[PDB]
Structure 1
């Protein structure tokens, strides 16, 4: 995807799992990849900006800082995988709010402050990823299911409001092999390598593809929707789910 080369791409958390796979892809494409998270992902091919995306003030500044640097913002990839930080475990009513903070409001803040700069740039597209926790098991997954659907609605607003200047799309993954899913397995069956393997195999057979997805497979869809190859695709969710939703 030659068009992605040198475009400024912000991934919100690029240390592990999906965020990492995404980050990897755009680097192979030749982007200026910026990592908006609370952790430096170690690799010196991405540039990290210290920010808690649930805090609007931190997002506001961080975005402006990013724009003073690379003088451009093309792609905004909103994603939440192991930056849902607190006590988890279970809890409930404060936990319900915090999951909505991370999985919805972090998407709104990053979007509200990026849009004004993005429209100034070339081929701006925003790609929103649903939580992997959406289809798994009710610890109490209601907040995940809710903020996934919320994120669709958000995607659809942005799409409609900012066409034809800027594009917006959602990627909706099923269960993907990530630190987040490995944790869910562990909370269900403990920390035995075989038992976690067996459980993950079991979740795989829930999908008609008879396996769970790979982060690389969600990286592809994001790259595609952010690419010029998707220049007429906007306001939609692309299901990367191994045919779970059918």
Structure 2
């Protein structure tokens, strides 16, 4: 179809669970060869098993997006065995305290930059690419959680717009998806009172599914989305936390 990613290699960080897993499976459904990453060898192997179980061609790999050496080594590995990743989804991130938002957002954006700069060479050669950055999920307890959510989203939006402007003349798009309260391993077991309070602020009246984030990412990765760049797509059931 026109949604096809056949012939494309995709790299999805943080793919062993939750949103990242769902992204990897959706890109695979669309025909990409998917490389999914975890911070451990056991995670990488699990990804491979998940991809097999779903008929997706690709691999699991160990990647630490905080490390220049890890990034360079991993990308060389991929280039030698699978091909140049032309679709890259930055999903891996590194109580919440009222004073740690800065180091979290700072670190995460430094990792987005690190990985993006590493993969842009291959996209620049191909004169095509998709870079999709995934924001953090709502749910963390406290005013500190709200603080961090909004701070991370603001970093994400700015970074994505800036990079999009930098690389657009190469037919590379750069977009973000900002999830709301999504059913993941991290939110499923939040205290009931908190889950109930969050649901009360969501017009749709339900958590989002990981797959509902992944469908958006799959669209953005498609040829149909070629004129969408610099955007942050909120996927939040109408709940806009700021």
TM-score, structure 2 as length reference: 0.83
Shift of 1:25: 0.7
Q: Which residue of 1 aligns with 2:7?
A: 6
Match of 1:70 among 82, 86, 108: 82
Q: Which residue of 1 aligns with 2:64?
A: 52
Q: Which residue of 2 aligns with 1:155?
A: 160
> CA-to-partner distance for each residue in 1:156-214, whole Å, 9 max, x for gaps?
1111111131110111111111112235x1xxx3xxxxx4xx75354223111111111
Match of 2:108 among 92, 100, 103: 103
Distance 1:4 1:241 in 2: 26
Q: Which residue of 2 aligns with 1:178?
A: 184
> CA-to-partner distance for each residue in 1:41-86, whole Å, 9 max, x for gaps?
3423441121111112211221222122223211010113xx64xx
- Contact preservation (8 Å) 1:126, 1:168: yes
TM-score, structure 1 as length reference: 0.82
Report whether the alignment pairs 1:61 with 2:67: no
Note the residue ranges of structure 1 that are not aligned, 5 or more in a row. 190-194
Shift of 1:105: 2.1
Determine helix, strand or coil for the equivalent of 2:142.
coil
Distance 1:148 1:126 in 2: 17
Q: How does 1:147-226 map to 2 (within 5 A)?
A: 147-165=152-170, 166-182=172-188, 185=190, 189=191, 195=192, 199-226=194-221
Determine helix, strand or coil for the equivalent of 1:4.
coil
- Contact preservation (8 Å) 1:103, 1:148: no
Distance 1:199 1:144 in 2: 15
Q: Which residue of 1 aligns with 2:144?
A: 140
Q: How does 1:35-46 map to 2 (within 5 A)?
A: 35-38=36-39, 39-40=43-44, 41=47, 42-43=49-50, 44=52, 45=56, 46=58
Shift of 1:137: 3.8
Determine helix, strand or coil for the equivalent of 1:52.
coil
Distance 1:212 1:23 in 2: 21
Distance 1:139 1:102 in 2: 21
Q: Post-superposition, which runs of at least 4 consecutive aligned residues in structure 1 deviate over 6 A?
A: none
Note the residue ranges of structure 2 that are not aligned, 5 or more in a row. none
Distance 2:74 2:177 in 1: 25
- Contact preservation (8 Å) 2:71, 2:118: yes
